[PDB]
């Protein structure tokens, strides 16, 4: 009795390279395979041939990759054909009308009326390679009204679209936006915002910043702040400063009137404190403030002139712990009997990861671990083969922090299923490292099943899912009686920013029916460039630059590559600070487009495939559910 | 004892929606305005008033106690995220990497010149390879640093013979080392400095670490124009050899004036006579001219009444030349569009882009884009458009905006959402069921209450006919709304009294063809001389009304009434060779250009204008021809001559003649429609001014309209004195206060002739003076400064205005700064023959009086002295003409001798004492019969002792010297 498998991504993007992975379980000789796709329901036919031969000498491997043409256009669906001689398997898959990515660069985020906005539009596909499409670029004022409209193509420009706009000296104040969409996809629009404010050039600069990035509520020391003021040419200021503290409730601000203090400024340096006493008198009860944020307002009046500068530091997070703990990386499903690996995510109150945070599990600690630079550490707990849902709690245990200062977090992990009640599992485990392209990564295949059908399992099929597409496919051999097999996977620049790994095995079941156990795991790689680009001083170091001077710039990039440059004042660059066009911020947009949802595993045997962005369908009666939705469950 | 903190504690109470009114009430007032007084200027609810009143009541009593017994008194406020001015981005260029790769590494050297800014630059790079995709590089930091830096700090402008003290600021950036520097001001004969040709002026100064130093210089500018001031610096021990060379502008002693002299339509045939047209043009008055200033007469020939305008409306940097007024308000800002729109239309319909230049068009379209972009700043929810951003929306203004927008839909992209929402607004919300339109804002334009209803509906109905077949499907009840308004017109039209309305509403009715019979007669008989529809006093409105009447005449295709009207409109240019205001200009522009487009007459250009200036030997022969990119020609003369113009054969055009000169100060003699009292007083010395301000003063303006109804859109045009600058805090408070005494301030130095501050007002009360005051700071100390000017005027009727000058105060003997040495004696040399040495022998007199230049030699007796602030007038009676010039003068007649203010102390002429004077024919000033004299570098002034006092010791020596001179000049004269 044979078995024939068709494996395909969850949502099929039009006009793009898509892989239809085919196999053959238990078949004497080889069988011709042709795949064809139709509109559902209708005799349309978007692809005809594309044949592959399932050679026994190659374990029956099949690629057949094709791009679906875009034509007559409630969320559309396509019926896919998988003919293996006589018996044919079909699937109703969801279609996606999504071009790719537009990125918008702006030299500054704030402008004066009169000045020029220098912006570029980067046109790239799903592999983040440049592609020549038609794009439409608008400039809106804060009131939504478009004041500049352009239709331009991005071919021969190899990606880049340089544009310019002069702000008239009498114009709307506020957050002007730059909307940009592919003419192929007026549905999907990309935006960047900038301000116009108005000409304001203060005499001196004031920076108000606390000694701590946060406030610990029970800490009786209070929130100390350092007021620094100095002229634009580095003269230390002498004057007076009026500070006042307040609590921000999401986007509603409550001024604490009794926190207003008047301090003298001596040699550009000043000191003030918001006490816990006065803090709690601005509302009561301490715990209600955890999650709220504090802000300072500093007004510095000179001793010489009447000149006066204001400065505001807000978003100072009130915390019960200097650290956070997250389970957003950890799978939500465990396999009773097998070990369960936790991907604990530890962040500072602001959002950035925290290096070296000793963490352990509640109920049974010891062993411990150490956080990497990406703020992740792995923790495993072997629990009993129980059908009961597992509730885990992970605390932190940093040295030189009090026990009442640490952070705690709970998650709920539901059991597998093994339909129907056969208790045979597969566990994928990976080492948590700062892994860089070019290195090798060991992948552990753990088997747990009754000692009767454990000799029949000869191979594991593993599948790579990268950037929503199917990446690589292969096999993993197994000698009967083996409880663990390792896979040497060679990571390249094709796995950035992150890749999923689905592994499954199939056999004649314990009772009589087919059993197909599956599991998935998520692995993050160093989220940087596919190529590279470096800017440094071309001249032999020597001495520092001087105004109006000739200097040399070295550009270390990729052959044939096009490099677009701009030189901005550090004063506006550090003034962003959220619309920064980083490489990390580029991959973040690729991750939030990725499919699907669950950071690994599933509710059942085929709930794994859907939660990783795949549709498994058997020649028997074992398939995944139909995905009619494009996005995920609400965060 | 806190006051700053007792403040904000009071703002501490009161709900969120109210802290605005309390905050603004706690503030003081530039005027002495009281608490209750401040109210009723306040525009919000009465809940807002109750807080405002309670809070300044609270504070004015609290600081009223501070006087009884150096502490701050300001607001901490909320949310100012300041600093917007950052250095412009650069290196906006693209380079691809074509160097042979070394395992990916494709190094590409790139050479650049760093900007001359002391800052830290952030170079951002983004790669794009069709092999390996996009790659955003890390920021590269370059800290551009300089140890020593000079900044030369000069005033915006200095008036000739003023005494500015400039300063050279020097910065030492070194973090732990004080710089010693040798700094020098270089000699420039343009101005008296401490540096002369004799010896230089260098001095050593030591600048502390991480700080700056100011080095003052006194300069007395002798010549007008742009003069170069240069300080040079050589720092000790370091070979840092730096210097700064800026240019300060020395303006003359009065106020700039473009005086329109003539206009005259140039049309041979038409009443220009078969005796082809001859045109007499009188000399410009220039009676009030400033002694020793230039003038210039600009004669312009126009091939078409619209030509200068067409030329200007098309160009971006000459577009502002259509209007003498500021353009920072709802309807004023429409220069950005209106002229250009009609000008492009005009050239489209007459097919002239070919000869004129097609390149200019794409340029012209960009202006209308820009203008449109600007106009959107005035647009509110929903689509309503107000005269000032975030303020009560205007029915008149929206109507206007709807017109130009509707008439632009073809030229640039107009958002139909923006356009049709406005038409949707005017109709659904502003039109009464009677067909009339309502105005709920304060009126921008020309004020039973018919005609109020009749005029505004006329203006709105003219707007809706442009949106007719654009907002068809967008706005449902357009065609019915126009009908309602059209019906209201042809019923009440026969009751119209004001000549203005009869035209505008006449045109509105003409557009429908509903101006007929008895109504048409009404429209036609309202014109004086059958060439204009005009009203008493309302001058620039008559240019507006007449223009409409032309548009109505063209709408009726009645091309007999038209010629004389176009002639009249052609010549109503009293502010330069131009109509003055926006609404005036764009109205005549449209109509005159509409005449060009709707003419059944091939009125072609072959004009042959010849010019004979009595100053030039050669005639001037201009030939303006149709089919040549121009239709323009101009000529300049430095002399104020009366000349004669001759036009010949075929063409209807214009001949604008305008002279520019500098009229003296002196407050306007007959403010006929506006009252103005201007005051400047020293603020208390502990007021706390900005760190650079040497001295602060309070400037109070008080103005009142002389009409039976309030004046609408009006302007204060305040030109600061020299070195002075207005406190932008106080002006803000005046415009952004919950009270609000102002609609906005401009502070625009268009260019040159002293930096100006423009204040927009919604109205000027005719009931009482409308006072507002504000602080001015003096960032340089100056001596002998000339008065700054202030001008009020109605924005839409410039004919009504008032000009006053303001000046600190004497208090007995004006002071210099300084004398003590040659620097002071340098300045005085300029005026009056510098004796010095005090020899002055009889033999020395005869040599100097015999200069071939010496035209007159009088013995005068000083009758009256009328010393002003800018120039001194000495009225001298002639006692004996020892030598008469081209100016004959009788013994016993009087001549007025003018001297600069910087020479009063040197001349020291006491009233009713006798003098010996002489000088060149160059000294003569202002033609007969009454002549004046200018005491200049060639004017010998000397005291003539009286007879009763020739007995004294110091006099008998000097007495018979003058007696020997008197005879040896009458009896014998000059020997050679
Ligand atoms: C009051 O009446 C006076 C006249 O008495 C007028 O005020 C000024 O009058 C000047 C003549 O005395 C006018 O100068 C003309 O402006 C030209 C500007 O050049 C243009 O540049 C633009 C770039 O945007 C180009 O597109 C054009 O093609 C032109 O080239 C000057 O070229 C011209 O004289 C020049 O001066 C420059 C100085 O840098 C020289 O380098 C050059 O060799 C040449 O001699 C002349 O100055 C001027 O238009 C005008 N200034 C104002 C106010 O703009 C006004 O008509 C009246 N004032 C008002 C507004 O009431
Ligand atoms: C499916 O076919 C592709 C394309 O033939 C294969 O991927 C690589 O193909 C290139 C052809 O130049 C070979 O050099 C590589 O060795 C192949 N890489 C491997 C082994 O995966 C591959 O056979 C299949 N890849 C997928 C999408 O599973």
Q: How would you write B176-190 as a 3-class SS string?
A: CCCEEEEEEECCCCC
Strand pairing report for A215-216 and A308-319 = parallel
Residue A350 sits in a domain whose CATH number is 2.60.40.10
User: Which residues on chain B are in Cβ contact (under 8 Å) with A312?
Assistant: 79, 81
Closest-CA residue to B81 (of A26, A415, A311): A311
How many beta-carbon contacts under 8 Å exist across A and B?
344
> Quick one: resolution in A?
3.3
> Do A531 and B135 form a contact (C-beta atoms < 8 A)?
yes
> Do B818 and B707 form a contact (C-beta atoms < 8 A)?
no
Residue B567 CA to residue B573 CA, distance in Å, equals 12
- B59-85 burial, b at 16+ Cβ within 10 Å, e below that, comes to beebeeeeeeeeebbbbbebeeeebbe
Evaluate whether residue A374 is within a structural domain.
yes
Range of the domain at A603: 1-100+593-624
Contacts of B185 by beta carbon, 8 Å cutoff, 6+ apart: B168, B193, B194, B195, B201, B217, B229, B230, B231
User: Which residues on chain B are in Cβ contact (under 8 Å) with A257?
Assistant: 8-9, 12
**What's the gap in Å between the CA of B130 and the closest CA on chain A?**
6
DSSP-derived secondary structure for B202-223: EEEEEE-TTEEEEEEEEEEE-S
- Residue carrying structure tokens 């203006």: B459
**Ligand of minimum distance to the alpha carbon of A461:** 2
Do A531 and B104 lie within an 8 Å CB cutoff? yes
Closest residue, chain A, to B368 (C-alpha): A147
Residue A257 sits in a domain whose CATH number is 2.60.40.1940
Count of residues in chain A: 635
Evaluate whether residue A10 is within a structural domain.
yes
Count CA atoms closer than 13 A to A195's CA, side-chain side.
14
3-class SS shares of chain A: helix, strand, coil, % to 5 = 5, 45, 45
Count CA atoms closer than 13 A to A539's CA, side-chain side.
12
Closest-CA residue to A163 (of A151, A171, A174): A151
Do residue A85 and residue A22 come from a single domain?
yes
Evaluate whether residue A635 is within a structural domain.
no
Helix, strand, or coil (residue A74):
coil
Strand pairing report for B620-625 and B606-612 = antiparallel
Residue B798 CA to residue B783 CA, distance in Å, equals 35
> Do A123 and A102 form a contact (C-beta atoms < 8 A)?
yes
Sign of the C-alpha dihedral computed for residues A618, A623, A629 and A630 taken in this order: negative
Evaluate whether residue A239 is within a structural domain.
yes
In this structure, what are the phi and psi dihedrals at residue B731, rounded to the nearest 5 degrees? -60, -45
Q: What would the two tokens of residue A460 be?
A: 């594991």
> Do B398 and B426 form a contact (C-beta atoms < 8 A)?
yes
- Residue carrying structure tokens 């307002």: A297
Helix, strand, or coil (residue B686):
coil
> Do A78 and A40 form a contact (C-beta atoms < 8 A)?
yes
Last residue of a domain, one of A290, A321, A352: A321
Angle at A258 between CA A253 and CA A259, to 5 degrees: 70
Closest-CA residue to B570 (of B557, B561, B582, B579): B579
Q: What would the two tokens of residue B298 be?
A: 């600009």
Residue B890 CA to residue B881 CA, distance in Å, equals 8
Strand pairing report for B894-900 and B797-806 = unpaired
Do residue A206 and residue A316 come from a single domain?
yes
Q: Which long-range CB contacts under 8 A does A375-379 form with residues at least 24 apart?
A: A375/A345, A375/A346, A375/A347, A376/A329, A376/A343, A376/A344, A376/A345, A376/A346, A376/A432, A376/A524, A377/A344, A377/A346, A377/A432, A378/A341, A378/A342, A378/A343, A378/A344, A378/A431, A378/A432, A379/A341, A379/A342, A379/A344
Do residue A442 and residue A524 come from a single domain?
yes
Q: Which are the residues after which chain B is interrupted (C to N > 2.5 Å)?
A: 69, 447
- Residue carrying structure tokens 């005090």: B838
Helix, strand, or coil (residue B543):
helix
- B161-190 burial, b at 16+ Cβ within 10 Å, e below that, comes to bbbbbbbbebbbbbeeeebebebbbbbbeb
Secondary structure E strands in B508-625: 606-612, 620-625
Cis omega (within 30 of 0) for bond into A596:
yes
**What's the gap in Å between the CA of B683 and the closest CA on chain A?**
14
Sign of the C-alpha dihedral computed for residues B486, B491, B496 and B499 taken in this order: positive
- Residue carrying structure tokens 């309670």: B54
Residue B530 CA to residue B428 CA, distance in Å, equals 40
Secondary structure E strands in B1-139: 94-96, 106-113, 119-129, 133-136
Count of residues in chain B: 976
Q: What would the two tokens of residue A516 be?
A: 């197909």
Do residue A22 and residue A107 come from a single domain?
no
Q: What would the two tokens of residue B495 be?
A: 């009751």
The total number of structural domains in chain A stands at: 6
Closest-CA residue to A340 (of A367, A371, A378): A378
Secondary structure E strands in A86-133: 87-96, 101-106, 116-124
DSSP-derived secondary structure for A297-350: EEEEEESSSS-EEEEEEEEEEEESSS-EEE-SSS-SEE-TTSEEEEEEEEE-TT
* Distance between Cα B313 and ligand 1 center (Å): 16
Residue A58 CB–ligand 2 contact under 6 Å: no
Q: What would the two tokens of residue A2 be?
A: 């044979």
**How far, in Å, are A53, A175, A190 from residue A193 at the CA level?**
53, 6, 11
Evaluate whether residue A266 is within a structural domain.
yes
DSSP for residue B430: I
Residue B269 CA to residue B280 CA, distance in Å, equals 18
**Structural determination approach:** X-ray
**How far, in Å, are A441, B250, B288, B785 from residue A378 at the CA level?**
16, 77, 93, 80
Last residue of a domain, one of A300, A321, A342: A321
Torsion over CA of A363, A365, A370 and A371, rounded to 10 degrees?
Answer: 0
Last residue of a domain, one of A148, A174, A201: A201
Residue B740 Rama label (left phi>0; alpha psi -120 to 50; beta)? left
Burial of B888: CB neighbours in 10 Å, binned 0-12, 13-18, 19+: exposed
**Ligand of minimum distance to the alpha carbon of B257:** 1
Map out the domains of chain B with their CATH numbers. Answer: 1-70 (1.20.91.20), 87-147 (2.20.130.20), 148-252 (2.60.40.10), 253-303+604-665 (2.60.120.1540), 304-603 (1.50.10.20), 666-809 (2.60.40.690), 831-976 (2.40.50.120)
Do residue A172 and residue A82 come from a single domain?
no
**Ligand of minimum distance to the alpha carbon of A489:** 2
Q: What would the two tokens of residue B92 be?
A: 């906006």
In this structure, what are the phi and psi dihedrals at residue A123, rounded to the nearest 5 degrees? -100, 115
Compute the radius of gyration of chain B from its Cα atoms: 34
Contacts of A128 by beta carbon, 8 Å cutoff, 6+ apart: A101, A530, A586, A590, B133, B134
Contacts of A605 by beta carbon, 8 Å cutoff, 6+ apart: A417, A418, A419, A515, A516, A517, A518, A622
> Do B797 and B887 form a contact (C-beta atoms < 8 A)?
no
Residue A7 sits in a domain whose CATH number is 2.60.40.1930
Evaluate whether residue A68 is within a structural domain.
yes
Do residue A522 and residue A604 come from a single domain?
no
- Residue carrying structure tokens 């458009």: B385
Q: Could you write out the three-class secondary structure of B313-344?
A: HHCCCCHHHHCCCCCCCCCHHHHHCHHHHHHH
Q: What would the two tokens of residue B722 be?
A: 């020299």
> Do B915 and B876 form a contact (C-beta atoms < 8 A)?
yes
DSSP for residue A375: S
Do residue A307 and residue A273 come from a single domain?
yes
Do residue A572 and residue A582 come from a single domain?
yes
Angle at B870 between CA B868 and CA B873, to 5 degrees: 50
Closest-CA residue to B568 (of B583, B557, B579, B558): B579
Do residue A80 and residue A136 come from a single domain?
no
**How far, in Å, are A321, A335, A362, A392 from residue A409 at the CA level?**
11, 21, 10, 9
Secondary structure E strands in A348-435: 359-361, 376-382, 390-396, 408-415, 425-430
For the CA of B317, the nearest atom of ligand 1? 24
**What's the gap in Å between the CA of B801 and the closest CA on chain A?**
27
Do B377 and A147 lie within an 8 Å CB cutoff? no
Sign of the C-alpha dihedral computed for residues A603, A607, A609 and A614 taken in this order: negative
Residue B256 CA to residue B754 CA, distance in Å, equals 10
Helix, strand, or coil (residue B636):
strand
User: Which residues on chain A are in Cβ contact (under 8 Å) with B119?
Assistant: 569-571
Interface test with A, best of B126, B150, B335 (most A CBs within 10 A): B126
Do residue A216 and residue A304 come from a single domain?
yes
Residue A629 CA to residue A626 CA, distance in Å, equals 9
Evaluate whether residue A634 is within a structural domain.
no
Residue B379 CA to residue B373 CA, distance in Å, equals 11
Outline where A228-312 has alpha helix (H): 276-280
Helix, strand, or coil (residue B442):
coil
Do residue A400 and residue A484 come from a single domain?
no
Secondary structure E strands in B284-417: 296-302
Burial of A331: CB neighbours in 10 Å, binned 0-12, 13-18, 19+: buried
Residue A570 sits in a domain whose CATH number is 6.20.50.160
Residue B468 CA to residue B453 CA, distance in Å, equals 22
Secondary element (H or E) of residue B565: helix B562-570
Evaluate whether residue A30 is within a structural domain.
yes
Sign of the C-alpha dihedral computed for residues B451, B457, B460 and B461 taken in this order: negative
Residue A19 CB–ligand 2 contact under 6 Å: yes
Residue nearest ligand 2's atom 3 by CA = A63
Residue B864 CA to residue B911 CA, distance in Å, equals 6
Do residue A443 and residue A535 come from a single domain?
no
Closest-CA residue to B932 (of B290, B295, B294): B290
Residue B426 CA to residue A449 CA, distance in Å, equals 79
Count CA atoms closer than 13 A to B51's CA, side-chain side.
22
Residue A63 CB–ligand 2 contact under 6 Å: yes
User: Which residues on chain B are in Cβ contact (under 8 Å) with A116?
Assistant: 88
Closest-CA residue to A295 (of A341, A239, A251): A251
């Amino acid at each position: 009795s044979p078995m024939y498998s068709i494996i395909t991504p969850n949502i099929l993007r039009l006009e793009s390279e898509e892989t239809m992975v085919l196999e053959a379980h238990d078949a004497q000789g080889d069988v011709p395979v042709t795949v064809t796709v139709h509109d559902f329901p209708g005799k349309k036919l978007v692809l005809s041939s594309e044949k592959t031969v399932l050679t026994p000498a190659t374990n029956h491997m099949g690629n057949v990759t094709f791009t679906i043409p875009a034509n007559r256009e409630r969320n559309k669906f396509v019926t896919v054909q998988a003919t293996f001689g006589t018996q044919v398997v079909e699937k109703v898959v969801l279609v996606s009308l999504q071009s790719g990515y537009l990125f918008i660069q702006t030299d500054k985020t704030i402008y004066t009326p009169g000045s020029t906005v220098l912006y570029r539009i980067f046109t790239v596909n799903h592999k983040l390679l440049p592609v020549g499409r038609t794009v439409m670029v608008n400039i809106e004022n804060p009131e939504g009204i478009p004041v500049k409209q352009d239709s331009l193509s991005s071919q021969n420009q190899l990606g880049v679209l340089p544009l310019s706009w002069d702000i008239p000296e009498l114009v709307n104040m506020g957050q002007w936006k730059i909307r940009a969409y592919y003419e192929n996809s007026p549905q999907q629009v990309f935006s960047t915002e900038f301000e116009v404010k108005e000409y304001v050039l203060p005499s001196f600069e004031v920076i108000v910043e606390p000694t701590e990035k946060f406030y610990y509520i029970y800490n009786e020391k209070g929130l100390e702040v350092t007021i620094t003021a100095r002229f634009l040419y580095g003269k230390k200021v002498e004057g007076t400063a009026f500070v006042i503290f307040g609590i921000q409730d999401g986007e509603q601000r409550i001024s604490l009137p009794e926190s207003l203090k008047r301090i003298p400024i001596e040699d550009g340096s000043g000191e003030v404190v918001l006490s816990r006493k006065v803090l709690l008198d601005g509302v009561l009860r301490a715990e209600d403030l955890v999650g709220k944020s504090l802000y300072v307002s500093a007004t510095v009046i000179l001793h010489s002139g009447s000149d006066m500068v204001q400065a505001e530091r807000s978003g100072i997070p009130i915390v019960t712990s200097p650290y956070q703990i997250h389970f957003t990386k950890t799978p939500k499903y465990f396999k009773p009997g097998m070990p369960f690996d936790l991907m604990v995510f530890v962040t500072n109150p602001d959002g950035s990861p925290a290096y070296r945070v000793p963490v352990a599990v509640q109920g049974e600690d010891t062993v411990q671990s150490l956080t990497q630079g990406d703020g992740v550490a792995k923790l495993s707990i072997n629990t009993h083969p129980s059908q009961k849902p597992l509730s885990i709690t992970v605390r932190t245990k940093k040295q030189e922090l009090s026990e009442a200062e640490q952070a705690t977090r709970t998650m709920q992990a539901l059991p597998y299923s093994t339909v129907g009640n056969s208790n045979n599992y597969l566990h994928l485990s990976v080492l948590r490292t700062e892994l860089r392209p070019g290195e090798t990564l060991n992948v552990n295949f753990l088997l747990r099943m009754d000692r009767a059908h454990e000799a029949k399992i000869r191979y594991y099929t593993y599948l790579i899912m990268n950037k929503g597409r199917l990446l690589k496919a292969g096999r993993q051999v197994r000698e009967p009686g083996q409880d663990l097999v390792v896979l040497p996977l060679s990571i390249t620049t094709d796995f950035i920013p992150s890749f999923r790994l689905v592994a499954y095995y199939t056999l004649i079941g314990a009772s009589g029916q087919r059993e197909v156990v599956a599991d998935s795991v998520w692995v993050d790689v160093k989220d940087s460039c596919v190529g590279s680009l470096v800017v440094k001083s071309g001249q032999s170091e020597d001495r520092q630059p001087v105004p109006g001077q000739q200097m040399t710039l070295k550009i270390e990039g990729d052959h044939g590559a096009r490099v677009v440059l701009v030189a901005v004042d550090k004063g506006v660059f550090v003034l962003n600070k959220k619309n920064k066009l980083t490489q990390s911020k580029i991959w973040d947009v690729v991750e939030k487009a990725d499919i699907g949802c669950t950071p690994g595993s599933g509710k059942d045997y085929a709930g794994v495939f859907s939660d990783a962005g795949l549709t498994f369908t058997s020649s028997s009666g074992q398939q995944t559910a139909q995905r009619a939705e494009l996005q995920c469950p609400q965060p | 004892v806190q006051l700053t903190e007792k403040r904000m504690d009071k703002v501490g109470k009161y709900p969120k929606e109210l802290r605005k009114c309390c905050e603004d009430g706690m503030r003081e007032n530039p005027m002495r305005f009281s608490c209750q007084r401040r109210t009723r200027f306040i525009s919000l609810g009465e809940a807002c008033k109750k807080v405002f009143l309670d809070c300044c009541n609270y504070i004015t009593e609290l600081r009223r106690q501070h006087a009884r017994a150096l502490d701050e008194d300001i607001i901490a406020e909320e949310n100012i995220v300041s600093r917007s001015e950052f250095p412009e981005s650069w290196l906006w260029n693209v380079e691809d990497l074509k160097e042979p790769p070394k395992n990916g590494i494709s190094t590409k050297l790139m050479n650049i010149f760093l900007k001359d800014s002391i800052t830290t630059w952030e170079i951002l790079a983004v790669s794009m390879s069709d092999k390996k995709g996009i790659c955003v590089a890390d920021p590269f930091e370059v800290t551009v640093m300089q140890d020593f830096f000079i900044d030369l700090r000069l005033p915006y402008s200095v008036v000739r013979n003023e005494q500015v003290e400039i300063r050279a600021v020097l910065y030492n950036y070194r973090q732990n080392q004080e710089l010693k520097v040798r700094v020098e001001l270089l000699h420039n004969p343009a101005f008296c400095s401490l540096a002369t040709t004799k010896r230089r002026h260098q001095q050593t100064v030591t600048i502390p670490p991480k700080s700056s130093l100011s080095v003052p210089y006194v300069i007395v500018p002798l010549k007008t124009g742009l003069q170069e001031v240069e300080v040079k610096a050589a720092v000790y021990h370091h070979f840092i050899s730096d210097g700064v060379r800026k240019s300060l502008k020395v303006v003359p002693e009065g106020i700039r004036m473009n005086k329109t002299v003539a206009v005259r339509t140039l049309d041979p045939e038409r009443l220009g006579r078969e005796g082809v047209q001859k045109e007499d043009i009188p000399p410009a008055d220039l009676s009030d001219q400033v002694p020793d200033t230039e003038s210039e007469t600009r004669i312009l020939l126009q091939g078409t009444p619209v030509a200068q305008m067409t030329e200007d409306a098309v160009d971006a940097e000459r577009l502002k030349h259509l209007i003498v007024t500021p353009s920072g308000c709802g309807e004023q800002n429409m220069i950005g569009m209106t002229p250009t729109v009609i000008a492009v239309h005009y050239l489209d319909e007459t097919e002239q882009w070919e000869k004129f230049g097609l390149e200019k068009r794409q340029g012209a379209l960009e202006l209308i884009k820009k203008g449109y972009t600007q106009q959107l700043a005035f647009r509110q929810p929903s689509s309503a458009f107000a005269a000032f951003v975030k303020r009560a929306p205007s029915t008149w203004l929206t109507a206007y905006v709807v017109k130009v927008f509707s008439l632009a839909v073809n030229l640039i992209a107009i958002d139909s959402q923006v356009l049709c929402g406005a038409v949707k607004w005017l109709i659904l919300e502003k039109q009464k069921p009677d067909g009339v339109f309502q105005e709920d804002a304060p009126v921008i334009h020309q004020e039973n209450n018919n005609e109020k209803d009749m005029a505004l509906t006329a203006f709105v109905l003219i707007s809706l006919q442009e949106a007719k077949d654009i907002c068809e499907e967008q706005v449902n009840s357009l065609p019915g709304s126009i009908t309602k308004a059209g019906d209201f017109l042809e019923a009440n039209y026969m009751n119209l009294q004001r000549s203005y309305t009869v035209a505008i509403a006449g045109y509105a009715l003409a557009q429908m063809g509903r101006l007929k019979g008895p109504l048409l007669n009404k429209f036609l008989t309202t014109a004086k001389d059958k060439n204009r529809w005009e009203d008493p006093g309302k001058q620039l409105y008559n240019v507006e009304a007449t223009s409409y009447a032309l548009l109505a005449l063209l709408q009726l295709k009645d091309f007999d009434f038209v010629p004389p009207v176009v002639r009249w409109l052609n010549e109503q240019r009293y502010y330069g060779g131009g109509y003055g205001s926006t609404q005036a200009t764009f109205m005549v522009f449209q109509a005159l250009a509409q005449y060009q487009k709707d003419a059944p007459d091939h009125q072609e250009l072959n004009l042959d204008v010849s010019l004979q200036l009595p100053s030039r030997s050669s005639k001037i022969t201009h030939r303006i021809h149709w089919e040549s990119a121009s239709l323009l020609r101009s000529e300049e003369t430095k002399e104020n001559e009366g000349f004669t113009v001759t036009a010949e054969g075929k063409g209807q055009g214009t001949l604008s003649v305008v002279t520019m000169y500098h009229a003296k100060a002196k407050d306007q003699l007959t403010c006929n429609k506006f009252d103005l009292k201007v005051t400047i007083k020293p603020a208390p010395e502990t007021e706390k001014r900005p760190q650079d301000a040497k001295n602060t003063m309070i400037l109070e303006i008080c103005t009142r309209y002389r009409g039976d109804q309030d004046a609408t859109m009006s302007i204060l045009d305040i030109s600061m004195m020299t070195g002075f600058a207005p406190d932008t805090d106080d002006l803000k408070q005046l415009a952004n206060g919950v009270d609000r005494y102002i609609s906005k301030y401009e502070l625009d130095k268009a260019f040159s002739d002293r930096n100006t501050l423009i204040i927009y007002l919604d109205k000027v009360s005719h009931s009482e003076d409308d006072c507002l005051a504000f602080k001015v700071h003096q960032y340089f100390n100056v001596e002998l400064i000339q008065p700054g000017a202030v001008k009020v005027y109605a924005y839409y009727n410039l004919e009504e205005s008032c000009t006053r000058f303001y000046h600190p105060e004497k208090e007995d003997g004006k002071l210099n700064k300084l004398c003590r040495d040659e620097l002071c004696r340098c300045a005085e040399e300029n005026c009056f023959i510098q004796k010095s040495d005090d020899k002055v022998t009889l033999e020395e007199r005869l040599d100097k009086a015999c200069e071939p230049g010496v035209d007159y030699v009088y013995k005068t007796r000083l009758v009256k002295v009328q010393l002003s602030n800018d120039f001194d007038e000495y009225i001298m009676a002639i006692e004996q003409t020892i030598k008469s010039g081209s100016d004959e003068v009788q013994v016993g007649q009087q001549r007025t001798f003018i001297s600069p203010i910087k020479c009063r102390e040197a001349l020291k002429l006491e009233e009713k004492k006798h003098y010996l004077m002489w000088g060149l024919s160059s000294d003569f000033w202002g033609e007969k019969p009454n002549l004046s004299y200018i005491i200049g570098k060639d004017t010998w002034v000397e005291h003539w002792p009286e007879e009763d006092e020739c007995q004294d010791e110091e006099n008998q020596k000097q007495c018979q010297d003058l007696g020997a001179f008197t005879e040896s000049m009458v009896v014998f004269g000059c020997p050679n």
